[PDB]
């Protein structure tokens, strides 16, 4: 029988290239623009990925759409943190193999202020020495981190699916012997990082929503992101979001 985490591991999507021509100089506008086009391709891959997570397709189609709309930024930022954490010990952002933002590229105007919220994720993964298995359980949990004010059409089932992946995160923590007040502290620490993603996403979405809405900025978003953003902007103004937390 295959374990649940091994099933999350085989569906881990391939690395996408940004298509960034480095023979041309950098600019903040050029990088932000390239990243949005990459972001849309990465979100399309996250849809294919979500559909293969055991249990996810059993939710009402409207709930599948809802979870993907609420969590896309959280999934994008968490996965970027992982790639950055695995790339080097240095303070870099590995957006793609052809677009790595080093300390020299961070000197670009307004670059550091958007990049620091993203650098926090890899910093926490380095500091907590997060494993591949813990990451895979945590990333699936980030997909199930927000729900509508009045919940989902398959809420009962969602709470069951969510519980299963919380238990799965527990199993990965224990697999790193370990035991026992040491384990409770690992669960505390990792679920605290999961909770802080809501704050990371809030900062990322402020940039995202502003650059989308202000057409004088000339910052393009592909169909995939434009659609999700158009749908999500009113949901953040009508309080139609219940951000799930492990620690109150």
């Amino acid at each position: 029988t295959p374990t649940l985490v091994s099933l999350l591991e085989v569906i881990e999507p391939e690395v996408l290239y940004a298509g960034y021509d480095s023979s041309v100089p950098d600019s903040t506008w050029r990088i932000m623009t390239t990243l949005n086009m990459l972001g849309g391709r990465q979100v399309i891959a996250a849809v294919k990925w979500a559909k293969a997570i055991p249990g996810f397709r059993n939710l009402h189609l409207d709930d599948q759409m809802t979870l993907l709309q609420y969590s896309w930024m959280s999934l994008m930022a968490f996965a970027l943190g992982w790639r950055s954490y695995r790339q080097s010990s240095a303070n870099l952002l590995c957006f793609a193999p052809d677009l790595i933002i080093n300390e020299q590229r961070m000197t670009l105007p307004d670059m550091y202020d958007q990049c620091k919220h993203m650098l926090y994720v890899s910093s926490e993964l380095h500091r907590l020495q997060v494993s591949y298995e813990e990451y895979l359980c945590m990333k699936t949990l980030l997909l199930l981190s927000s729900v509508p004010k009045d919940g989902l059409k398959s809420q009962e089932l969602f709470d069951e699916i969510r519980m299963t992946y919380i238990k799965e995160l527990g199993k990965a923590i224990v697999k790193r012997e370990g035991n026992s007040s040491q384990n409770w502290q690992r669960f505390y620490q990792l679920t605290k990082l999961l909770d802080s993603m809501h704050e990371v996403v809030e900062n990322l979405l402020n940039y995202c929503f502003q650059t989308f809405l202000d057409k004088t900025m000339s910052i393009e978003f592909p169909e995939m992101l434009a659609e999700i953003i158009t749908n999500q902007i009113p949901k953040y103004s009508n309080g139609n979001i219940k951000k799930l937390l492990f620690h109150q």
Partner: peptide, 13 residues
């Protein structure tokens, strides 16, 4: 309406 997202969930793959 989330046309692309619905399409990607409804399509095969």
């Amino acid at each position: 309406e989330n046309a692309l997202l619905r399409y990607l969930l409804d399509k095969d793959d």
